[PDB]
Automatic annotation (TrEMBL), chain A:
It comes from the Eukaryota. This is Putative NOC2 family protein. It is found in: Nucleus. Belongs to the NOC2 family. The lineage of its organism: Eukaryota, Fungi, Dikarya, Ascomycota, Pezizomycotina.
UniProtKB/TrEMBL annotation, chain B:
The chain holds residues 493 to 590 of 688 of the full protein. Required for synthesis of 60S ribosomal subunits and the transport of pre-ribosomes from the nucleoplasm to the cytoplasm. It is found in: Nucleus, Nucleolus. This is Nucleolar complex-associated protein 3. It comes from the Eukaryota. Belongs to the CBF/MAK21 family. It comes from Chaetomium thermophilum (strain DSM 1495 / CBS 144.50 / IMI 039719).
UniProtKB/TrEMBL annotation, chain C:
Required for proper 27S pre-rRNA processing and 60S ribosome subunit assembly. The keyword Metal-binding does not apply. This is 60S ribosome subunit biogenesis protein NIP7. Residues 96-171 form the PUA domain. It comes from Chaetomium thermophilum (strain DSM 1495 / CBS 144.50 / IMI 039719). It comes from the Eukaryota. One of its GO terms (biological process) is assembly of large subunit precursor of preribosome. InterPro entries: NIP7_N, Nip7_N_euk, PUA, PUA-like_sf, PUA_sf, Ribosomal_synth_fac_NIP7, UPF0113_PUA. It is found in: Nucleus, Nucleolus. Its main location: nucleus. It holds the Pfam family pre-PUA_NIP7. GO terms for cellular component: nucleolus. One of its GO terms (molecular function) is RNA binding. Keywords: Nucleus, Ribosome biogenesis, RNA-binding.
TrEMBL record, chain D:
It comes from Chaetomium thermophilum (strain DSM 1495 / CBS 144.50 / IMI 039719). Belongs to the LOC1 family. Residues 74-88 have a biased composition (Basic and acidic residues). This is 60S ribosomal subunit-like protein. Component of the 66S pre-ribosomal particle. Required for efficient assembly and nuclear export of the 60S ribosomal subunit. It is found in: Nucleus, Nucleolus.
Amino acid sequence: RKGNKNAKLGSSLVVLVQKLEMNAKFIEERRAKVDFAPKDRAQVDAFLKDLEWEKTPLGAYVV
Amino acid sequence: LEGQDAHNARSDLHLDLSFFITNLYRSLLSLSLNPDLELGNNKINLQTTTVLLLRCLTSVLLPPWNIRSVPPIRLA
Amino acid sequence: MRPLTDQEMKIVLDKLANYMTDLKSLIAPLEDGDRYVFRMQKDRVYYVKLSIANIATCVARDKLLSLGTCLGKMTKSGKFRLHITALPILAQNARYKIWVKDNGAQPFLYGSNIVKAHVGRWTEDCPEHSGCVVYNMADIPLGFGVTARSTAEARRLDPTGIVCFRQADCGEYLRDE
Amino acid sequence: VYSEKELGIPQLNTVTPVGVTKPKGKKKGKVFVDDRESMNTILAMVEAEKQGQIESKIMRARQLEEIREARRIEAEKKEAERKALLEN
RNA sequence: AAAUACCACUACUCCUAUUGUUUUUUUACUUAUUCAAUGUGAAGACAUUGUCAGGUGGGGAGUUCCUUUAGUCCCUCGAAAUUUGAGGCUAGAGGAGAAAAGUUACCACA
């Protein structure tokens, strides 16, 4: 959109990229408070085992 | 600019590589998603784009001259 | 509050280019469609976000006391002078910068001129009367000024000899207390 | 030595035009530089006299060209503003 | 502060149910609306837009309000209950005009 006229693919990719950005942001807020010194990585090794693949915005998208 | 005479000429001759550094910085992502990186005594004429990228990055981050003067912001 | 005029902008940018390399960096647009603009309250120039200036427009002129970062003051004769409040922006974009030891950092903070007996690191190829931001050995922005001699002259200079002329130091924050 | 501003010296018309001069002791209308393009052109001129002498002819030409492009963009934006405020 | 026996009233806080009202948030769909074309397609109840109440206005056009003092204990708003604060009235005192102007037992130079 300065190509083709395939608005179906256009809309599908715009919603895809919006959801990818939302998931990246979601990772920002839940990772902003994690300590990752190079000799102590307990929090990052215990980061998100307790969350299942439907809570994430991209999980909702994919399901 | 990594030639000796040009290095000593730098300030007098107004030879600034800020444009090249910024261009490499802005093109890193496009090169990362490029699919033809490895589709390939010389110091310039190198057949592989990833080899060229390592030469650029070595010149920038690890220059032969003033290696302990590189801006930390650039390095990071 | 009002924007700067053409002559005022020219003078302010002349001083800022005397002390810095890149100024399109200062006036460049940001990600959120916002940019840094210049404002004037009383006889002082303020480096501010456009959004902050627009949202501070509602404040009355006689009751607005500061905005963004105070960059300096326009003198009675129409001459701009920078400030230790303007030190940070000079720190991001300094052209020439001179480091001093602790035994010279304390004198500079008291308000003295830098000496090569205090210097511990130089900037190569520095003209005689240029723009140098004074740091300590911990890369802490300590002040700014104009150097007195070139690098070669300072090296061949007497260890007890003035190398830089002080214009502002961080001790003025103990003035305005 | 006394300043030409202090002395009441009339402006003289030369190859550099005087233009429409303003009456003395009256309201000199303040034109404001708050546009990104106007800041660009003023900045380009300032950096030009700050850098000064360049050995390379192409480098000098590029410096002059960036100043010219700044003026061109400023003029275009001002003309567009004129059109916008004259029609709408 | 308030004292419990006796028996009367309504006052909040937290929950439940249906025999009902509204408002807000998220999501879904097009008919509001936005964009492209000529001899129908896309986005979407969000934007955009409009009306009032206001704040700032060193810019443009036109012309030449608060604070203090003393008083009647005269009126309104706010607060606490057994008293106050802010305004209101009477008349003294403060604040040709964005070009610049005035001023200092101060600094630097001459």
